[PDB]
PDB file of C-alpha atoms and ligand atoms in Angstrom:
ATOM      1  CA  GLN A   1      -0.018   0.007  -0.006  1.00 35.01           C
ATOM      2  CA  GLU A   2       2.399   2.770   1.226  1.00 34.17           C
ATOM      3  CA  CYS A   3       5.186   2.770   3.913  1.00 28.72           C
ATOM      4  CA  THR A   4       8.121   5.168   4.510  1.00 29.65           C
ATOM      5  CA  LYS A   5      10.723   4.309   7.143  1.00 27.41           C
ATOM      6  CA  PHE A   6      13.454   6.827   7.827  1.00 24.67           C
ATOM      7  CA  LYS A   7      14.722   6.223  11.354  1.00 24.70           C
ATOM      8  CA  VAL A   8      12.583   3.222  12.269  1.00 24.11           C
ATOM      9  CA  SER A   9      14.315   1.112  14.939  1.00 27.81           C
ATOM     10  CA  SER A  10      11.321  -0.517  16.695  1.00 29.57           C
ATOM     11  CA  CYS A  11       7.922  -1.988  15.985  1.00 29.03           C
ATOM     12  CA  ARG A  12       6.263   1.020  17.583  1.00 30.35           C
ATOM     13  CA  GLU A  13       8.297   3.503  15.563  1.00 28.32           C
ATOM     14  CA  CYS A  14       7.181   1.573  12.487  1.00 26.27           C
ATOM     15  CA  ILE A  15       3.468   1.673  13.246  1.00 25.39           C
ATOM     16  CA  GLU A  16       3.841   5.436  13.992  1.00 30.42           C
ATOM     17  CA  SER A  17       5.332   6.223  10.579  1.00 28.64           C
ATOM     18  CA  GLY A  18       2.045   5.751   8.760  1.00 33.03           C
ATOM     19  CA  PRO A  19      -1.066   3.592   8.398  1.00 32.75           C
ATOM     20  CA  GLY A  20       0.406   1.552   5.517  1.00 33.93           C
ATOM     21  CA  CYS A  21       3.358   0.302   7.613  1.00 37.02           C
ATOM     22  CA  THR A  22       3.571  -3.127   9.207  1.00 34.20           C
ATOM     23  CA  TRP A  23       6.347  -4.927  11.098  1.00 32.28           C
ATOM     24  CA  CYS A  24       7.849  -8.380  10.701  1.00 32.53           C
ATOM     25  CA  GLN A  25       8.502  -9.805  14.197  1.00 31.79           C
ATOM     26  CA  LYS A  26      10.154 -13.082  12.989  1.00 33.99           C
ATOM     27  CA  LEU A  27      13.789 -13.445  14.133  1.00 36.15           C
ATOM     28  CA  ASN A  28      14.548 -15.486  10.976  1.00 36.25           C
ATOM     29  CA  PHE A  29      13.628 -12.483   8.744  1.00 34.25           C
ATOM     30  CA  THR A  30      16.863 -10.533   8.980  1.00 31.97           C
ATOM     31  CA  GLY A  31      20.549 -11.216   8.380  1.00 36.16           C
ATOM     32  CA  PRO A  32      23.751  -9.653   9.851  1.00 36.38           C
ATOM     33  CA  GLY A  33      24.090  -6.892   7.243  1.00 39.34           C
ATOM     34  CA  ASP A  34      20.477  -5.664   7.049  1.00 41.68           C
ATOM     35  CA  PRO A  35      19.246  -2.613   8.984  1.00 37.88           C
ATOM     36  CA  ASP A  36      16.296  -2.977  11.382  1.00 36.89           C
ATOM     37  CA  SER A  37      14.150  -0.831   9.079  1.00 36.22           C
ATOM     38  CA  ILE A  38      13.775  -3.720   6.564  1.00 35.59           C
ATOM     39  CA  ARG A  39      11.241  -5.257   8.971  1.00 36.35           C
ATOM     40  CA  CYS A  40       9.095  -2.147   8.420  1.00 37.32           C
ATOM     41  CA  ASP A  41       7.175  -2.282   5.128  1.00 35.37           C
ATOM     42  CA  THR A  42       3.738  -2.623   3.474  1.00 32.12           C
ATOM     43  CA  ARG A  43       1.998  -5.992   3.985  1.00 33.80           C
ATOM     44  CA  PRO A  44       2.657  -7.233   0.398  1.00 35.66           C
ATOM     45  CA  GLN A  45       6.379  -6.305   0.486  1.00 37.94           C
ATOM     46  CA  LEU A  46       6.997  -8.265   3.692  1.00 40.25           C
ATOM     47  CA  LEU A  47       4.866 -11.188   2.539  1.00 40.28           C
ATOM     48  CA  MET A  48       6.697 -11.857  -0.764  1.00 38.92           C
ATOM     49  CA  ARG A  49       9.959 -11.259   1.089  1.00 41.48           C
ATOM     50  CA  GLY A  50       9.259 -14.324   3.269  1.00 41.41           C
ATOM     51  CA  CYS A  51       7.559 -12.918   6.368  1.00 43.81           C
ATOM     52  CA  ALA A  52       4.699 -15.182   7.505  1.00 44.55           C
ATOM     53  CA  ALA A  53       1.212 -13.671   8.062  1.00 43.29           C
ATOM     54  CA  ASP A  54       1.135 -14.640  11.747  1.00 43.28           C
ATOM     55  CA  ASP A  55       4.371 -12.665  12.465  1.00 43.57           C
ATOM     56  CA  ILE A  56       3.342  -9.394  10.755  1.00 39.38           C
ATOM     57  CA  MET A  57       2.346  -6.790  13.364  1.00 38.94           C
ATOM     58  CA  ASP A  58      -0.284  -4.398  12.027  1.00 35.65           C
ATOM     59  CA  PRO A  59      -2.476  -2.821  14.718  1.00 41.68           C
ATOM     60  CA  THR A  60      -5.602  -1.075  13.334  1.00 42.12           C
ATOM     61  CA  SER A  61      -7.842   1.741  14.534  1.00 41.02           C
ATOM     62  CA  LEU A  62     -11.257   0.607  15.813  1.00 39.05           C
ATOM     63  CA  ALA A  63     -14.423   1.799  17.480  1.00 37.78           C
ATOM     64  CA  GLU A  64     -15.719   0.051  20.561  1.00 40.11           C
ATOM     65  CA  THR A  65     -19.249   0.710  21.884  1.00 39.27           C
ATOM     66  CA  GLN A  66     -18.932   0.690  25.664  1.00 40.95           C
ATOM     67  CA  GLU A  67     -22.325   1.788  27.053  1.00 37.13           C
ATOM     68  CA  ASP A  68     -25.499   2.091  24.972  1.00 38.27           C
ATOM     69  CA  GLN A  69     -30.566   7.496  27.454  1.00 36.03           C
ATOM     70  CA  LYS A  70     -33.039   9.063  25.098  1.00 34.32           C
ATOM     71  CA  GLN A  71     -32.072  11.124  22.027  1.00 35.10           C
ATOM     72  CA  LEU A  72     -28.325  10.546  21.379  1.00 36.07           C
ATOM     73  CA  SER A  73     -27.048   6.965  21.214  1.00 36.27           C
ATOM     74  CA  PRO A  74     -24.585   5.590  22.122  1.00 33.64           C
ATOM     75  CA  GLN A  75     -23.765   7.493  25.343  1.00 33.49           C
ATOM     76  CA  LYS A  76     -20.183   6.151  25.479  1.00 32.71           C
ATOM     77  CA  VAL A  77     -17.683   5.093  22.829  1.00 35.18           C
ATOM     78  CA  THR A  78     -13.993   4.094  23.017  1.00 36.92           C
ATOM     79  CA  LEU A  79     -11.724   4.676  20.016  1.00 37.10           C
ATOM     80  CA  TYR A  80      -8.278   3.179  19.446  1.00 33.55           C
ATOM     81  CA  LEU A  81      -6.528   5.485  17.036  1.00 35.71           C
ATOM     82  CA  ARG A  82      -3.550   4.361  14.941  1.00 36.64           C
ATOM     83  CA  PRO A  83      -2.042   7.564  13.519  1.00 38.93           C
ATOM     84  CA  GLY A  84      -3.370   8.419  10.061  1.00 38.97           C
ATOM     85  CA  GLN A  85      -6.117   5.821  10.231  1.00 38.74           C
ATOM     86  CA  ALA A  86      -9.636   7.014  10.921  1.00 37.39           C
ATOM     87  CA  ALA A  87     -11.859   5.268  13.451  1.00 39.23           C
ATOM     88  CA  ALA A  88     -15.524   5.588  12.588  1.00 39.59           C
ATOM     89  CA  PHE A  89     -18.708   5.103  14.641  1.00 42.23           C
ATOM     90  CA  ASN A  90     -22.369   6.000  14.320  1.00 41.55           C
ATOM     91  CA  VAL A  91     -24.504   8.251  16.478  1.00 41.71           C
ATOM     92  CA  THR A  92     -28.288   7.877  16.248  1.00 40.77           C
ATOM     93  CA  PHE A  93     -30.453  10.932  17.038  1.00 39.73           C
ATOM     94  CA  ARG A  94     -34.085  10.407  18.131  1.00 36.27           C
ATOM     95  CA  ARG A  95     -36.922  12.447  19.662  1.00 34.05           C
ATOM     96  CA  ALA A  96     -40.707  12.722  20.227  1.00 35.40           C
TER      97      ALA A  96
ATOM     98  CA  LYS B   1     -41.284  18.080  19.796  1.00 31.92           C
ATOM     99  CA  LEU B   2     -40.545  17.966  16.052  1.00 26.15           C
ATOM    100  CA  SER B   3     -36.858  18.887  15.890  1.00 24.69           C
ATOM    101  CA  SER B   4     -36.224  21.150  12.890  1.00 26.61           C
ATOM    102  CA  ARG B   5     -32.410  21.379  13.462  1.00 21.89           C
ATOM    103  CA  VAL B   6     -29.979  18.742  14.712  1.00 22.29           C
ATOM    104  CA  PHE B   7     -26.435  20.106  14.712  1.00 24.73           C
ATOM    105  CA  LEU B   8     -23.864  17.585  15.906  1.00 25.38           C
ATOM    106  CA  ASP B   9     -20.657  19.277  17.193  1.00 22.90           C
ATOM    107  CA  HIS B  10     -17.798  18.438  19.572  1.00 25.53           C
ATOM    108  CA  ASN B  11     -16.029  20.436  22.263  1.00 24.35           C
ATOM    109  CA  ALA B  12     -12.461  21.803  21.732  1.00 27.68           C
ATOM    110  CA  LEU B  13      -9.927  19.253  20.468  1.00 28.52           C
ATOM    111  CA  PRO B  14      -6.132  19.274  20.353  1.00 26.64           C
ATOM    112  CA  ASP B  15      -4.164  19.892  17.046  1.00 26.15           C
ATOM    113  CA  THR B  16      -3.587  16.154  16.877  1.00 30.92           C
ATOM    114  CA  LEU B  17      -7.296  15.126  16.577  1.00 30.05           C
ATOM    115  CA  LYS B  18      -9.635  15.747  13.670  1.00 29.64           C
ATOM    116  CA  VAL B  19     -13.266  14.793  13.391  1.00 31.80           C
ATOM    117  CA  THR B  20     -15.602  14.886  10.410  1.00 30.89           C
ATOM    118  CA  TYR B  21     -19.252  13.886  10.002  1.00 30.91           C
ATOM    119  CA  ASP B  22     -21.476  12.336   7.388  1.00 26.91           C
ATOM    120  CA  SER B  23     -25.144  13.134   7.996  1.00 25.18           C
ATOM    121  CA  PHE B  24     -27.707  10.647   6.768  1.00 26.55           C
ATOM    122  CA  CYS B  25     -30.847  12.728   7.175  1.00 29.71           C
ATOM    123  CA  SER B  26     -34.498  11.684   6.691  1.00 26.55           C
ATOM    124  CA  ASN B  27     -35.038  13.946   3.617  1.00 27.16           C
ATOM    125  CA  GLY B  28     -33.298  11.757   1.103  1.00 33.31           C
ATOM    126  CA  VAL B  29     -30.569  14.235   2.130  1.00 33.01           C
ATOM    127  CA  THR B  30     -26.978  13.204   2.862  1.00 32.50           C
ATOM    128  CA  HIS B  31     -23.920  15.319   3.643  1.00 36.17           C
ATOM    129  CA  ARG B  32     -20.349  13.945   3.700  1.00 36.39           C
ATOM    130  CA  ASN B  33     -17.109  14.770   5.431  1.00 35.60           C
ATOM    131  CA  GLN B  34     -18.165  18.083   7.109  1.00 33.23           C
ATOM    132  CA  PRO B  35     -16.851  19.605  10.346  1.00 34.70           C
ATOM    133  CA  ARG B  36     -20.250  19.137  11.960  1.00 35.45           C
ATOM    134  CA  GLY B  37     -23.376  16.998  11.629  1.00 33.91           C
ATOM    135  CA  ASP B  38     -26.354  18.843  10.197  1.00 33.86           C
ATOM    136  CA  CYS B  39     -29.923  17.633   9.546  1.00 30.52           C
ATOM    137  CA  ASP B  40     -32.997  19.810   9.002  1.00 31.78           C
ATOM    138  CA  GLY B  41     -36.387  18.521  10.042  1.00 32.62           C
ATOM    139  CA  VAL B  42     -36.525  15.265  12.047  1.00 34.99           C
ATOM    140  CA  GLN B  43     -40.005  13.753  12.429  1.00 34.76           C
ATOM    141  CA  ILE B  44     -41.551  12.121  15.532  1.00 37.23           C
ATOM    142  CA  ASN B  45     -39.517   9.084  16.525  1.00 36.96           C
ATOM    143  CA  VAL B  46     -37.891   9.011  13.050  1.00 37.13           C
ATOM    144  CA  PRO B  47     -34.153   8.359  13.629  1.00 37.72           C
ATOM    145  CA  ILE B  48     -31.278   9.990  11.749  1.00 37.02           C
ATOM    146  CA  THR B  49     -27.670   8.693  11.647  1.00 36.45           C
ATOM    147  CA  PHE B  50     -24.380  10.585  11.779  1.00 38.92           C
ATOM    148  CA  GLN B  51     -21.121   8.783  10.973  1.00 40.39           C
ATOM    149  CA  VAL B  52     -18.261  10.300  12.985  1.00 39.80           C
ATOM    150  CA  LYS B  53     -14.689   9.681  11.803  1.00 39.48           C
ATOM    151  CA  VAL B  54     -11.817  10.462  14.170  1.00 40.75           C
ATOM    152  CA  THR B  55      -8.199  10.616  13.118  1.00 35.68           C
ATOM    153  CA  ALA B  56      -5.042  11.211  15.159  1.00 35.14           C
ATOM    154  CA  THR B  57      -1.836  12.485  13.439  1.00 33.37           C
ATOM    155  CA  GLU B  58       0.300  11.006  16.201  1.00 34.73           C
ATOM    156  CA  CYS B  59       0.200   8.807  19.283  1.00 36.22           C
ATOM    157  CA  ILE B  60      -1.956  10.543  21.829  1.00 33.95           C
ATOM    158  CA  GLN B  61      -2.510   9.754  25.501  1.00 35.44           C
ATOM    159  CA  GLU B  62      -5.728   8.684  27.154  1.00 34.55           C
ATOM    160  CA  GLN B  63      -8.200  11.545  26.911  1.00 35.89           C
ATOM    161  CA  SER B  64     -11.857  12.275  26.241  1.00 38.57           C
ATOM    162  CA  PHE B  65     -13.974  14.650  24.236  1.00 37.09           C
ATOM    163  CA  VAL B  66     -17.751  14.988  23.940  1.00 35.52           C
ATOM    164  CA  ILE B  67     -20.164  15.120  21.061  1.00 31.11           C
ATOM    165  CA  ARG B  68     -23.534  16.793  21.554  1.00 28.46           C
ATOM    166  CA  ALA B  69     -26.517  17.946  19.590  1.00 29.59           C
ATOM    167  CA  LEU B  70     -27.078  21.672  20.284  1.00 29.66           C
ATOM    168  CA  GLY B  71     -30.094  22.370  22.520  1.00 30.29           C
ATOM    169  CA  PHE B  72     -30.454  18.830  23.876  1.00 27.20           C
ATOM    170  CA  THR B  73     -29.055  17.494  27.157  1.00 25.13           C
ATOM    171  CA  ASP B  74     -27.867  14.105  25.932  1.00 26.10           C
ATOM    172  CA  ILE B  75     -24.177  13.569  25.253  1.00 26.27           C
ATOM    173  CA  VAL B  76     -21.809  11.020  23.597  1.00 26.78           C
ATOM    174  CA  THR B  77     -18.589  10.703  25.575  1.00 31.36           C
ATOM    175  CA  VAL B  78     -15.785   9.578  23.303  1.00 31.49           C
ATOM    176  CA  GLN B  79     -12.820   8.034  25.093  1.00 27.71           C
ATOM    177  CA  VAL B  80      -9.757   8.052  22.844  1.00 27.95           C
ATOM    178  CA  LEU B  81      -6.732   5.712  23.273  1.00 30.51           C
ATOM    179  CA  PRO B  82      -3.569   5.176  21.228  1.00 32.01           C
ATOM    180  CA  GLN B  83      -3.074   2.267  18.830  1.00 30.33           C
ATOM    181  CA  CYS B  84       0.702   2.528  18.347  1.00 32.94           C
ATOM    182  CA  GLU B  85       2.126  -0.284  20.541  1.00 33.11           C
ATOM    183  CA  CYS B  86       2.759  -3.694  19.097  1.00 35.56           C
ATOM    184  CA  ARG B  87       1.602  -6.926  20.785  1.00 35.54           C
ATOM    185  CA  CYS B  88       4.631  -9.207  20.649  1.00 35.12           C
ATOM    186  CA  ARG B  89       5.690 -12.457  22.294  1.00 35.63           C
ATOM    187  CA  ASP B  90       9.175 -11.762  23.671  1.00 37.89           C
ATOM    188  CA  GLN B  91      11.734 -13.508  25.919  1.00 38.93           C
ATOM    189  CA  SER B  92      13.243 -12.015  29.076  1.00 39.14           C
ATOM    190  CA  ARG B  93      16.650 -13.298  29.568  1.00 38.09           C
ATOM    191  CA  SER B  94      22.593 -13.665  25.066  1.00 39.06           C
ATOM    192  CA  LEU B  95      21.609 -12.165  22.663  1.00 35.51           C
ATOM    193  CA  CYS B  96      21.483  -8.496  23.490  1.00 34.12           C
ATOM    194  CA  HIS B  97      24.714  -9.065  25.498  1.00 36.66           C
ATOM    195  CA  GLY B  98      22.931  -8.162  28.760  1.00 37.50           C
ATOM    196  CA  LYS B  99      22.715  -4.522  27.558  1.00 37.16           C
ATOM    197  CA  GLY B 100      19.159  -4.818  26.313  1.00 37.92           C
ATOM    198  CA  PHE B 101      16.035  -6.901  25.900  1.00 38.82           C
ATOM    199  CA  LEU B 102      14.315  -8.315  22.822  1.00 36.64           C
ATOM    200  CA  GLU B 103      11.021  -6.887  21.567  1.00 38.13           C
ATOM    201  CA  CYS B 104       9.256  -7.897  18.334  1.00 34.06           C
ATOM    202  CA  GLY B 105      12.329  -9.678  16.901  1.00 33.03           C
ATOM    203  CA  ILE B 106      15.005  -7.029  17.636  1.00 31.45           C
ATOM    204  CA  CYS B 107      17.086  -5.804  20.612  1.00 33.04           C
ATOM    205  CA  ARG B 108      16.208  -2.665  22.545  1.00 34.50           C
ATOM    206  CA  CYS B 109      19.392  -1.230  24.041  1.00 33.92           C
ATOM    207  CA  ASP B 110      20.108   0.391  27.395  1.00 32.72           C
ATOM    208  CA  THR B 111      21.433   3.949  27.853  1.00 29.94           C
ATOM    209  CA  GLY B 112      24.848   4.153  26.242  1.00 28.36           C
ATOM    210  CA  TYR B 113      24.592   1.020  24.062  1.00 30.18           C
ATOM    211  CA  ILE B 114      23.964   0.521  20.327  1.00 32.19           C
ATOM    212  CA  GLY B 115      24.213  -2.084  17.532  1.00 34.24           C
ATOM    213  CA  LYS B 116      21.845  -4.930  16.562  1.00 35.57           C
ATOM    214  CA  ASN B 117      22.780  -7.062  19.604  1.00 34.00           C
ATOM    215  CA  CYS B 118      23.723  -4.183  21.925  1.00 35.28           C
ATOM    216  CA  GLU B 119      27.427  -5.083  21.481  1.00 32.34           C
ATOM    217  CA  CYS B 120      28.808  -1.514  21.343  1.00 31.06           C
ATOM    218  CA  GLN B 121      28.797   1.340  23.795  1.00 32.54           C
ATOM    219  CA  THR B 122      28.278   4.985  22.847  1.00 36.49           C
ATOM    220  CA  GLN B 123      31.132   7.473  22.368  1.00 34.50           C
ATOM    221  CA  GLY B 124      30.981  11.253  21.777  1.00 37.45           C
ATOM    222  CA  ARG B 125      29.596  10.982  18.237  1.00 39.67           C
ATOM    223  CA  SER B 126      30.884   5.232  16.831  1.00 41.43           C
ATOM    224  CA  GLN B 127      29.120   3.651  13.831  1.00 40.60           C
ATOM    225  CA  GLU B 128      30.141   6.712  11.780  1.00 41.49           C
ATOM    226  CA  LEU B 129      33.668   5.371  11.727  1.00 37.79           C
ATOM    227  CA  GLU B 130      32.634   2.308   9.665  1.00 37.45           C
ATOM    228  CA  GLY B 131      34.023   4.113   6.658  1.00 39.27           C
ATOM    229  CA  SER B 132      37.064   3.867   8.916  1.00 37.57           C
ATOM    230  CA  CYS B 133      36.863   0.072   8.569  1.00 38.49           C
ATOM    231  CA  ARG B 134      37.750   0.623   4.840  1.00 39.65           C
ATOM    232  CA  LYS B 135      41.259   1.781   3.942  1.00 39.29           C
ATOM    233  CA  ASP B 136      39.624   3.965   1.285  1.00 42.60           C
ATOM    234  CA  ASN B 137      36.049   4.519   0.015  1.00 43.80           C
ATOM    235  CA  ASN B 138      36.413   1.730  -2.618  1.00 40.49           C
ATOM    236  CA  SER B 139      38.284  -0.926  -0.609  1.00 38.55           C
ATOM    237  CA  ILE B 140      36.944  -4.058   1.103  1.00 38.34           C
ATOM    238  CA  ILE B 141      36.515  -4.394   4.889  1.00 35.81           C
ATOM    239  CA  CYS B 142      39.622  -4.657   6.987  1.00 32.78           C
ATOM    240  CA  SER B 143      41.685  -5.766   3.974  1.00 28.78           C
ATOM    241  CA  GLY B 144      39.667  -9.031   3.907  1.00 27.91           C
ATOM    242  CA  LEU B 145      41.565 -10.022   7.068  1.00 27.39           C
ATOM    243  CA  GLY B 146      39.369  -8.554   9.824  1.00 27.81           C
ATOM    244  CA  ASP B 147      35.810  -7.674  10.878  1.00 30.38           C
ATOM    245  CA  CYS B 148      34.274  -4.288  11.495  1.00 30.43           C
ATOM    246  CA  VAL B 149      33.408  -4.306  15.229  1.00 32.68           C
ATOM    247  CA  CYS B 150      31.896  -0.975  16.336  1.00 31.28           C
ATOM    248  CA  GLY B 151      33.344   0.972  13.405  1.00 30.67           C
ATOM    249  CA  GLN B 152      36.794  -0.427  14.067  1.00 27.82           C
ATOM    250  CA  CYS B 153      38.711  -3.358  12.582  1.00 23.52           C
ATOM    251  CA  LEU B 154      39.330  -6.424  14.766  1.00 24.18           C
ATOM    252  CA  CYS B 155      41.900  -8.447  12.915  1.00 24.88           C
ATOM    253  CA  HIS B 156      41.724 -12.182  12.338  1.00 22.89           C
ATOM    254  CA  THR B 157      43.805 -14.422  14.560  1.00 20.21           C
ATOM    255  CA  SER B 158      46.549 -16.499  12.990  1.00 19.45           C
ATOM    256  CA  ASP B 159      48.029 -19.926  13.847  1.00 18.90           C
ATOM    257  CA  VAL B 160      51.341 -19.230  12.093  1.00 18.05           C
ATOM    258  CA  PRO B 161      54.187 -18.805  14.653  1.00 17.42           C
ATOM    259  CA  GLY B 162      55.357 -15.203  14.996  1.00 19.19           C
ATOM    260  CA  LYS B 163      52.579 -13.796  12.811  1.00 18.29           C
ATOM    261  CA  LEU B 164      50.194 -11.064  13.892  1.00 20.26           C
ATOM    262  CA  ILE B 165      47.664  -9.292  11.644  1.00 20.65           C
ATOM    263  CA  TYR B 166      47.497  -5.619  12.739  1.00 24.87           C
ATOM    264  CA  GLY B 167      46.818  -2.051  11.590  1.00 22.73           C
ATOM    265  CA  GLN B 168      43.746   0.195  11.383  1.00 25.60           C
ATOM    266  CA  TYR B 169      42.593  -1.867   8.326  1.00 25.28           C
ATOM    267  CA  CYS B 170      44.386  -5.170   9.181  1.00 27.46           C
ATOM    268  CA  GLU B 171      46.699  -4.305   6.319  1.00 26.50           C
ATOM    269  CA  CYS B 172      49.977  -5.244   8.068  1.00 27.18           C
ATOM    270  CA  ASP B 173      51.587  -8.332   9.522  1.00 28.65           C
ATOM    271  CA  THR B 174      54.874  -9.405  11.171  1.00 27.35           C
ATOM    272  CA  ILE B 175      56.128 -12.075   8.679  1.00 25.85           C
ATOM    273  CA  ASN B 176      55.920 -10.753   5.078  1.00 23.35           C
ATOM    274  CA  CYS B 177      59.372  -9.037   4.767  1.00 24.44           C
ATOM    275  CA  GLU B 178      62.380  -9.802   2.628  1.00 25.59           C
ATOM    276  CA  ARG B 179      64.296 -12.893   3.745  1.00 24.28           C
ATOM    277  CA  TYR B 180      67.982 -13.511   4.262  1.00 24.91           C
ATOM    278  CA  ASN B 181      69.672 -16.811   5.242  1.00 26.78           C
ATOM    279  CA  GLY B 182      66.322 -18.637   5.625  1.00 21.70           C
ATOM    280  CA  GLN B 183      64.755 -16.293   8.158  1.00 23.34           C
ATOM    281  CA  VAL B 184      62.695 -13.103   7.854  1.00 21.38           C
ATOM    282  CA  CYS B 185      64.877  -9.962   8.113  1.00 23.03           C
ATOM    283  CA  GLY B 186      67.884 -12.163   8.717  1.00 21.86           C
ATOM    284  CA  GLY B 187      66.315 -13.659  11.815  1.00 19.50           C
ATOM    285  CA  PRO B 188      65.837 -12.046  15.244  1.00 18.03           C
ATOM    286  CA  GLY B 189      69.611 -11.460  15.676  1.00 17.23           C
ATOM    287  CA  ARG B 190      69.605  -9.019  12.724  1.00 15.25           C
ATOM    288  CA  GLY B 191      66.167  -7.385  12.366  1.00 12.34           C
ATOM    289  CA  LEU B 192      62.396  -7.412  12.844  1.00 13.67           C
ATOM    290  CA  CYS B 193      59.572  -7.581  10.274  1.00 14.41           C
ATOM    291  CA  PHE B 194      56.953  -4.845  10.395  1.00 16.58           C
ATOM    292  CA  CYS B 195      54.397  -4.231   7.598  1.00 16.98           C
ATOM    293  CA  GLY B 196      56.796  -5.369   4.850  1.00 16.72           C
ATOM    294  CA  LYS B 197      59.778  -3.289   6.057  1.00 17.11           C
ATOM    295  CA  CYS B 198      62.624  -4.771   7.989  1.00 19.62           C
ATOM    296  CA  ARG B 199      63.679  -2.828  10.996  1.00 21.06           C
ATOM    297  CA  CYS B 200      67.304  -3.691  11.503  1.00 23.11           C
ATOM    298  CA  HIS B 201      69.053  -3.794  14.868  1.00 24.10           C
ATOM    299  CA  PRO B 202      71.938  -1.368  15.367  1.00 24.03           C
ATOM    300  CA  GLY B 203      74.787  -2.881  13.401  1.00 22.90           C
ATOM    301  CA  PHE B 204      72.913  -4.172  10.311  1.00 22.13           C
ATOM    302  CA  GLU B 205      71.667  -2.666   7.064  1.00 19.56           C
ATOM    303  CA  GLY B 206      69.901  -3.436   3.826  1.00 19.84           C
ATOM    304  CA  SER B 207      66.350  -4.338   2.886  1.00 17.03           C
ATOM    305  CA  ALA B 208      66.565  -7.701   4.733  1.00 15.00           C
ATOM    306  CA  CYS B 209      69.352  -6.781   7.206  1.00 15.24           C
ATOM    307  CA  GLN B 210      71.906  -8.755   5.100  1.00 17.45           C
ATOM    308  CA  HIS B 211      74.937  -6.481   5.723  1.00 15.00           C
ATOM    309  CA  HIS B 212      77.077  -4.867   8.463  1.00 17.94           C
ATOM    310  CA  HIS B 213      77.747  -1.092   8.821  1.00 19.76           C
ATOM    311  CA  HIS B 214      80.486   0.010   6.347  1.00 17.17           C
TER     312      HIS B 214
HETATM  313  C1  NAG C   1     -19.487   1.114   9.806  1.00 15.24           C
HETATM  314  C2  NAG C   1     -20.588   2.060  10.103  1.00 15.24           C
HETATM  315  O1  NAG C   1     -21.141   2.037  11.187  1.00 15.24           O
HETATM  316  N1  NAG C   1     -20.931   2.899   9.126  1.00 15.24           N
HETATM  317  C3  NAG C   1     -22.356   3.044   8.751  1.00 15.24           C
HETATM  318  C4  NAG C   1     -22.634   2.556   7.346  1.00 15.24           C
HETATM  319  O2  NAG C   1     -22.299   1.166   7.283  1.00 15.24           O
HETATM  320  C5  NAG C   1     -24.131   2.711   7.071  1.00 15.24           C
HETATM  321  O3  NAG C   1     -24.238   2.782   5.674  1.00 15.24           O
HETATM  322  C6  NAG C   1     -24.796   3.993   7.638  1.00 15.24           C
HETATM  323  C7  NAG C   1     -26.282   3.801   7.858  1.00 15.24           C
HETATM  324  O4  NAG C   1     -26.986   4.323   6.756  1.00 15.24           O
HETATM  325  O5  NAG C   1     -24.220   4.398   8.879  1.00 15.24           O
HETATM  326  C8  NAG C   1     -22.815   4.493   8.820  1.00 15.24           C
HETATM  327  O6  NAG C   1     -22.397   5.302   7.759  1.00 15.24           O
END
C-alpha cells in the first residue's frame, strides 16, 4: 500500500510512521548486514519477502461501543486510534 | 417536539485530533465529510444517523472529548486511546549481550549502548567510523583479514608462529618481509619484520638486514 521508514528502529516507531506500515517480528527474517528498518514495510512487500502472516504486526484503529438514554445513542464510545487511520462510529439521534 | 435542526458538534480538540461527519438525514438528504453534523427537520420518533470519523496524526494519550446535539441534554462521551504499541511475544533473559532486551524480533538497548545485539557502547559521536573500517572509499572491509566491530577493525587471529595481523585496516603483519639466510629480516639477531619493512638492529643494514655497517 504505502510505507516510509526513515529512522525506524522498533515495531512502535514503524506503526507510528504511517497507516500503511507493518512490522515483521520473525527473528529469521533478517541477516547480519540488514538494517532494522527492513522489517518495516507494506504488507505485500513483507509477505513476498518471506515474512509469515502470523508474524506481521499491524495494529488497526477501531471503534468500541462501551455503554448504549433518550435522544443521542450511544452514550459512550471508546476509540483506538492508529495515527493516520480514521476510526468511525455511528451516532443515532431520536426524539418525540 | 418535532426537531427542525440537529447540529452535531464536539467540544475543543487538540491539534492532533480531527473529526468529520457524514449526516444521513431523513429527507433523502446526505452530507459527507463536514466539520459538523447537520440535519434539517426530524419527524416524531424517526431516527437520523451521523457517521463520525476520528483521526489522530500522532500517538496521543488517554483523553476524552464529547459530542452533543445543540439544545439537547444528551451527550456522547468519546474516550480516545492510542493504537501505536505492538503486541509481541518476547523472551526475558545472550543475545542482546545483557545490555538490552528483545522486543518484536530485535534488541532494545540500554542507555549508552547501540548495535543490533547491543554489542557496542556509545562514544561522543561510533558507527560513523565504519568508513574507517575501509582503507579507502572503494576498498573491502579490513583488507579481507578482519571484521568491522563498532566501526573499528578487529583483525583475524593466526596460527602461524610469530605472525600477527594488525593495523587500522588489518593491512599489516609481522612475517611478510624480505628474507635472508632462511629467516625473515635475517632472523631475530639481525632485524624485525613490520608491515613489509625490516627494522634492522643497530649494526645491520639493507632491505633484509643482510649487511654490516660500512
Ligand atoms: C461502519 C458504520 O457504522 N458505518 C455506517 C454505514 O455502514 C451505514 O451505511 C450507515 C447507515 O446508513 O451508517 C454508517 O455510515
